[PDB]
């Protein structure tokens, strides 16, 4: 009944907007004003300790 149509739908949870301070300045985590985070997304940095 819950048929996957075409390539499916995008998973977007809701969570509070957060600004970050980086060398480039002020960065918004999401580009929308409806407070929609791409669920499951993360970033990483890997070093050679």
């Amino acid at each position: 009944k819950t048929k996957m149509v075409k390539k499916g739908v995008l998973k977007l949870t809701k969570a509070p907007l957060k600004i970050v301070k980086i060398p480039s300045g002020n960065h918004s985590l999401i580009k929308n004003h409806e407070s929609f985070y791409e669920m499951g997304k993360a970033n990483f940095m890997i070093k050679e300790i």
Partner: protein
């Protein structure tokens, strides 16, 4: 669902793409079943007749839904959700200090 209604373009698309002539039926576990077994389950009570069928698929990425209107106190028309959308700017955001962060080009 009161703020919006079905768009006329999507209704016309569904009407003369005949998507309602090609319904798919499901049992209580949401599995595709033939119309005969769907009728047999609905008659027996093992299937809810309301939420157990689909109206095929309409092609072309048409907007399914358009804003609904109502009458203001002076007899003018107005979108239902335009004026009660929000009242406060939700305060926010929080500026987290993360100067120590190696960015990637």
């Amino acid at each position: 669902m009161k703020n919006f209604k079905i768009s006329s373009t999507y209704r016309a698309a569904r009407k003369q793409q005949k998507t309602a002539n090609r319904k798919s039926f499901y049992n209580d576990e949401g599995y595709m079943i033939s119309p005969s077994e769907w009728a047999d389950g609905v008659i027996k009570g093992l299937i809810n007749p309301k939420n157990s069928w689909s109206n095929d698929h309409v092609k072309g990425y048409l907007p399914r839904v358009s804003p609904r209107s109502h009458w203001t106190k002076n007899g003018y028309r107005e979108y239902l959700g335009i004026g009660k959308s929000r009242d406060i700017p939700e305060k926010e955001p929080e500026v987290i200090e993360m100067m120590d962060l190696e960015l990637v080009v």
